[PDB]
Amino acid sequence: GKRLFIIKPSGFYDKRFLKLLRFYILLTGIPVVIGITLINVFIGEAELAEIPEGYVPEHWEYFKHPISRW
């Protein structure tokens, strides 16, 4: 009993902006995180090895992560 109306400013637009920001961040954040996990698990990182004699590497063969090499 005795419930009073609480006058507050319109909180609809601020919540709408926060929901839109979260949705549009996550829309590419979730696939990128999933793809990074799948790159790390299945492709994996490179292993340091000495250069074979007479062989010159490409300029992208000096990096460890697959994404950095790409």
Partner: protein, 459 residues
């Protein structure tokens, strides 16, 4: 550097052939695409710079400034489209065209290998900003602000042209890659003293130095929002880039010719922060804060140590982002209440809570809350100036105290307290303003995770 110049000039037929209602959408979309494309400049090496051609190159100093410019253009397009709502269509396209032209001149300025081409672009940047200020500004004295800004810049910069041509005739080249290997000591004489003054005064005016800063609380105030953003965020850093490039030729005469400006800029930041303590105008307060931070950058460049240079470039990028966000917030208040007085609209946290959160974050980054890149730059400059002399720690500590004081005075006056009774047109925040605030905030907070890409060419 032609892969960024050509889409920028292709933005011009995009805004001149669009529909009457689709100019903002098209220009914002394609500028954001080119801003995404600008990340390919991060192919920097530990020994050599990224040299594209005879005319263009980009080392690790010009790359953060380029990325900042190309990211700042869509922010100005999003900001400036509410007060140009009722404008004629041709005038709207002319405004967008001046923004595009300014971005083209700015991205040709930071990559110029030749020094005279850098000068030509650096003074070609004057016309679009002067036109923007004096045409789309709202006040009476926008004409006086444009006159002051134009004549301070040109009076500072004509001896720079004369001295650069003298250096070309004496050394044989103005190519920056050649001058790194062909440089010679500059002995102590009156001729070399006036050489140093001529080469330095243009960038001392543009930064600005204390005593030559009288054009800034006019051009920063009577400009529109996009003009204020591009003046605070990029145009003050042309002076910093110029002093970083031109100090190579001015050795060892800098070590005693830098004393008066070091005393002007060490005492000047105290004066400008104290001015910020007693400002009745919000826009003027932000402009004077910009003067203080650029005085810090001036001292860092003038003492010429590695830590000072890294702190100077980090502080330049951080202050550009923070000043742009503060000007945007002040503009949103101006659109709500149609006045720039700081005491008029009070207690807006009870009405605009998320905007109050954005205000709090901008104020926190203004007073260099760690681990923001603001604090990283300010801290590195403080360390290098302590290495220079020990009483500089007294001056820097006083400056930090007054900086925190006026930033929290801004926040407490505008957002806290009892609201104004007779003001009843405080609309809720649009999605556009919140998106603008978040696009200013999120890169600034993300750069604290990888701060190594804004630490200059000697990281």
């Amino acid at each position: 550097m032609l892969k960024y110049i050509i889409p920028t000039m292709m933005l011009m037929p995009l805004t001149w052939l669009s529909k009457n209602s689709m100019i903002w959408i098209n220009t914002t979309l394609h500028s954001l695409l080119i801003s995404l494309t600008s990340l390919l400049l991060l192919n920097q090496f530990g020994d050599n710079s990224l040299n594209f051609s005879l005319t263009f190159f980009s080392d690790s100093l010009s790359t953060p400034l380029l990325i900042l410019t190309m990211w700042l253009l869509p922010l100005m397009l999003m900001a400036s489209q509410h007060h140009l709502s009722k404008e004629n269509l041709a005038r709207k396209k002319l405004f967008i065209s001046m923004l595009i032209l300014l971005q083209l001149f700015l991205i040709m300025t930071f990559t110029a290998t030749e020094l005279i081409f850098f000068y030509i672009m650096f003074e070609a940047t004057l016309v679009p900003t002067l036109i923007i200020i004096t045409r789309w500004g709202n006040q009476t004295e926008r004409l006086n602000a444009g006159l002051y800004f134009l004549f301070y810049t040109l009076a500072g910069s004509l001896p720079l042209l004369v001295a650069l041509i003298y250096i070309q005739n004496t050394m044989g080249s103005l190519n920056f890659l050649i001058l790194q290997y062909w440089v010679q000591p500059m002995p102590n004489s009156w001729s070399n003293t006036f050489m140093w003054l001529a080469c330095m005064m243009a960038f001392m005016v543009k930064m600005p130095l204390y005593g030559l800063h009288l054009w800034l609380p006019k051009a920063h105030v009577e400009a529109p929002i996009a003009g204020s953003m591009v003046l605070a965020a990029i145009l003050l850093k042309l002076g910093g880039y110029g002093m970083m490039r031109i100090t190579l030729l001015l050795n060892p005469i800098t070590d005693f010719m830098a004393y008066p400006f070091i005393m002007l800029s060490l005492w000047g930041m105290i004066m400008t922060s104290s001015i910020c303590l007693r400002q009745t105008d919000l826009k003027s307060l932000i402009a004077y804060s910009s003067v203080s931070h650029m005085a810090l950058v001036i001292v860092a460049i003038l003492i010429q140590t590695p830590w000072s240079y890294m702190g100077a470039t980090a502080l330049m990028i951080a202050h550009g982002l923070t000043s742009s966000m503060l000007f945007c917030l002040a503009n949103s208040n101006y659109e709500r209440v149609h006045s720039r007085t700081m005491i008029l609209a009070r207690g807006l946290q009870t009405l605009l809570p998320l905007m109050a959160a954005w205000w709090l974050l901008a104020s926190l980054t203004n007073l260099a809350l760690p681990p923001s890149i603001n604090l990283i730059g300010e801290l590195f400059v403080v360390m290098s100036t302590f290495s220079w002399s020990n009483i500089t720690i007294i001056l820097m500590g006083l400056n930090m105290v007054i900086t925190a004081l006026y930033s929290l005075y801004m926040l407490i006056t505008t957002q806290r307290g009892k609201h104004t009774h007779h003001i009843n047109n405080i609309l809720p925040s649009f999605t556009r303003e919140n998106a603008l605030m978040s696009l200013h905030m999120l890169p600034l907070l993300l750069l604290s995770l990888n701060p190594k890409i804004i630490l200059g060419p000697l990281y």
